[PDB]
Amino acid sequence: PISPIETVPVKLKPGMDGPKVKQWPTEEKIKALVEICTEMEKEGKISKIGPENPYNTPVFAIKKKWRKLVDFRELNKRTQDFWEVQLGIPHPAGLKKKKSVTVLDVGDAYFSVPLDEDFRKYTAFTINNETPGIRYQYNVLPQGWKGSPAIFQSSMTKILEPFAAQNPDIVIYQYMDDLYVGSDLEIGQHRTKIEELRQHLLRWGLTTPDKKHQKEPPFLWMGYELHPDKWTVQPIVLPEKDSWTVNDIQKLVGKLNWASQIYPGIKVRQLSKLLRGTKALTEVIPLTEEAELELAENREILKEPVHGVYYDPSKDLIAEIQKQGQGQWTYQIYQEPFKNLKTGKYARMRGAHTNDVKQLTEAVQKITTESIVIWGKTPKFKLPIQKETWETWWTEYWQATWIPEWEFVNTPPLVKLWYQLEKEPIVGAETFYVDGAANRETKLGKAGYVTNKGRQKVVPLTNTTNQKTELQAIYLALQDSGLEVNIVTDSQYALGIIQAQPDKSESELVNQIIEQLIKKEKVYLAWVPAHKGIGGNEQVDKLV
């Protein structure tokens, strides 16, 4: 089943030569080898060579009937690079429904394409009983070789170029050694077009499934189940273990991600927090309380199976984002109210302090990208956030951002702004001057304030850093204050954290400062140069 296709020229990486890795004695294997060698020579796929000082690459033999294997590792290191075959995969949520869909698989797919002539010498393998060294040399794409997946895909593509213009009403997808064909014409017309193509391929050299088209749905494809009108993930088994290892928690959070695309509501936040001890691979990591709960809620979701629908270009694309908590959000993309196209989650915090609108802006983003890769368009967004909420956020956000057309949906928890600082100081409300410090050496510190009304405080702080104190200093001035406070700090650091207005943070102190800020009713933070004697600050800097 060799082919008349044009070969693709192949070069070695410049200034490299072809491999020379001598082999070494397997009487039963050495025999099996001879059997495959001639039975493959008869098909022209390899040819004997007269040792004219050519190269060499190893070769082995293993029973599954026997089978032949070649170690091309030293040759792939020397041949040029090719175009990347398929870095990604078609997501089923983006396929278009077809009445009938036929799955064909081409056997000997690599052995049915010719390999370039000037590049044939570098494939010389040899099969101590003073072995006569029956020197061979490939003539088709050798299996394992660096250039086979790319070249075969190109040959296959050209071999198909006549047929796809003759029958433009059918659709073929290429994927490695498979062809997936799907038409909307009659199931009798289908079996016919299939039979045409199989015979066309075979006029080039490509054998195809005999028993009809063979594969009958549902299709087990790349960890999916493709049903003639439904798609869903292949089934998932979350282990039950007394101890958990890094290998086990990554395999778990792989499986949980794999399921997030169609099982709504998955969470993997507190599970992957465990992986920050990524130091080893077999190191036991004790689960946490939030983790063991999370994995329990994930079990509850999977117990009943849910499925996905296919794409219909004539129907609009829609996206809904709902808040889960602890910096976790789920989305669903659908055309129809009950039929999901797919789902997924967004939890990344992009730092240690984030707010709800920002995390929702980031989420929309992840969806826009995903929508564009998958369906080639961007969806209409349905968003639990008022217009009044978002407008005021991005008008005052220091970053630029692009907020697509969206429709408000009231289905709580709506996203909100739990507090706004003032932009201007509060009249006649108390103005605390704050500062704090901590001898890094002593790792000890103090947080104090000094107000206009004459109040002064200093609290001792143990096991702190100069940064962590100047946030306690703000904390203090909040918890010792009326509902309208003007706080004033020298700390560029703590000013920065606050002015972003985080509603959620992974600092205990900063969550406490958030809570107080919610309770207050007019806070206004202002900033003045540190150790610049601005008056008052010199006081909070004398104490502390």
Partner 1 sequence: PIETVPVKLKPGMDGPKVKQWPLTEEKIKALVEICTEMEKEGKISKIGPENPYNTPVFAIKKKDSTKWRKLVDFRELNKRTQDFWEVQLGIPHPAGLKKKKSVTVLDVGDAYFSVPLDEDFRKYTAFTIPSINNETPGIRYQYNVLPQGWKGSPAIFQSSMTKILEPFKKQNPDIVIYQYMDDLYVGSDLEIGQHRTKIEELRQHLLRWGLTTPYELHPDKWTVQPIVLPEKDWTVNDIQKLVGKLNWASQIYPGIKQLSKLLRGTKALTEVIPLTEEAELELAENREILKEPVHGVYYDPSKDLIAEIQKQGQGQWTYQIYQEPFKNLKTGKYARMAHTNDVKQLTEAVQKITTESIVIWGKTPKFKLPIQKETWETWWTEYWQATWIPEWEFVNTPPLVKLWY
Ligand X SMILES: N#Cc1cc2c(Oc3ccccc3OCCC(=O)N3CCOCC3)cccn2c1
Site for Mg ion in 422-461 (CB under 5 A): 435
**Is 403 near ligand X (CB under 6 A)?**
no
Which CB atom, from 217 or from 265, has the smaller least distance to ligand X?
217
Per-residue contact string for residues 272-311; x = within reach of ligand X by CB under 6 A = --------------------------------------x-
**Is 60 near ligand X (CB under 6 A)?**
no
Residue 446 tokens, joined = 């103090």
Write out the binding residues for Mg ion, residues 461-490 only, by CB under 5 A. 490
**Is 15 near partner 1 (CB under 8 A)?**
no
Q: Is residue 242 part of an annotated ligand binding site?
A: no
Place of tokens 């001890």: 277
Write out the binding residues for partner 1, residues 450-469 only, by CB under 8 A. 450-452, 454
Q: Is residue 480 part of an annotated ligand binding site?
A: no
Least Å distance between CB 517 and Mg ion?
Answer: 23
Helical residues (DSSP H) of 241-321, grouped into ranges = 246-260, 269-273, 289-303
CA 230 to chain centre: 24
First vs last Cα of the chain: how many Å apart?
86
Instruction: Give the range of 95-103, 142-150, 270-278, 335-343 binding ligand X by CB under 6 A.
Output: 95-103
Name which position in 90, 144, 265, 425 contacts ligand X (CB under 6 A). 90
Q: Is residue 229 part of an annotated ligand binding site?
A: no
The residues, any chain, with a CB within 8 Å of residue 411's CB and separated by 6 or more, are 322, 384
Number of residues that bind partner 1 (CB under 8 A): 73
Q: Is residue 177 part of an annotated ligand binding site?
A: yes
Q: What's the half-sphere exposure (Cβ side, CA atoms, 13 Å) at 5?
A: 33
Breaks (C-N over 2.5 A) in the chain follow: 25, 64, 127
CA 297 to chain centre: 22
Burial class (CB in 10 A: 0-12, 13-18, 19+), 228: middle
**Is 104 near ligand X (CB under 6 A)?**
no
CA 323 to chain centre: 21
Q: Which of 174, 164, 181, 171 is nearest to 102 (CA)?
A: 181
Pairing of strands 406-408, 380-383: parallel
Q: Is residue 81 part of an annotated ligand binding site?
A: no
Name which position in 242, 400, 405, 508 contacts partner 1 (CB under 8 A). 400
Whether the bond between 502 and the residue before it is cis, its omega within 30 degrees of 0, is no
65-69 contacts: CB < 8 A, separation 24 or more? 66/29, 66/32, 66/35, 66/36, 68/32, 68/33, 68/36, 69/144
Residue 435 interacts with which of ligand X, Mg ion, partner 1, none, CB < 5 to 8 Å by class: Mg ion
Instruction: Give the range of 143-151, 187-195, 218-226, 349-357 binding ligand X by CB under 6 A.
Output: 218-226
* Cα distances (Å, whole numbers) of residue 96 to 41, 297, 380: 44, 33, 20
Instruction: Give the range of 233-241, 251-259, 323-331, 422-430 binding partner 1 by CB under 8 A.
Output: 422-430
Per-residue contact string for residues 196-215; x = within reach of ligand X by CB under 6 A = -------------------x
Which CB atom, from 164 or from 526, has the smaller least distance to ligand X?
164
Least Å distance between CB 361 and Mg ion?
Answer: 35
**Is 530 near ligand X (CB under 6 A)?**
no
**Is 162 near partner 1 (CB under 8 A)?**
no
Tally of CB atoms within 10 A around 43 = 15
Name which position in 58, 217, 425, 536 contacts ligand X (CB under 6 A). 217
Residue 536 interacts with which of Mg ion, ligand X, partner 1, none, CB < 5 to 8 Å by class: partner 1
Name which position in 55, 72, 136, 221 contacts ligand X (CB under 6 A). 221
**Is 433 near partner 1 (CB under 8 A)?**
yes
Residue 467 tokens, joined = 């940064």
Residue type at 103 in one-letter notation: V
Instruction: Give the range of 11-19, 88-96, 194-202, 279-287 binding ligand X by CB under 6 A.
Output: 88-96
Write out the binding residues for partner 1, residues 367-396 only, by CB under 8 A. 368-369, 372-378, 394-396
Which CB atom, from 356 or from 490, has the smaller least distance to Mg ion?
490
The residues, any chain, with a CB within 8 Å of residue 149's CB and separated by 6 or more, are 85, 176
**Is 233 near ligand X (CB under 6 A)?**
no
Residue 484 interacts with which of ligand X, Mg ion, partner 1, none, CB < 5 to 8 Å by class: none
- Distance between CA atoms of 142 and 129, rounded to whole angstroms? 28
- Distance between CA atoms of 530 and 537, rounded to whole angstroms? 8
- Distance between CA atoms of 193 and 191, rounded to whole angstroms? 6
Q: Is residue 312 part of an annotated ligand binding site?
A: no
Tally of CB atoms within 10 A around 188 = 7
Residue type at 348 in one-letter notation: R
SS3 458: strand
Write out the binding residues for partner 1, residues 74-133 only, by CB under 8 A. 80-91, 94-95
Which CB atom, from 7 or from 343, has the smaller least distance to partner 1?
7
Q: Is residue 503 part of an annotated ligand binding site?
A: no
Annotated binding site for Mg(2+): 105, 177-178, 435, 470, 490, 541
Which residues would be at the binding site for ligand X (CB under 6 A)? 90, 95-98, 101, 103, 171, 173, 180-182, 215, 217, 219, 221, 226, 228, 310
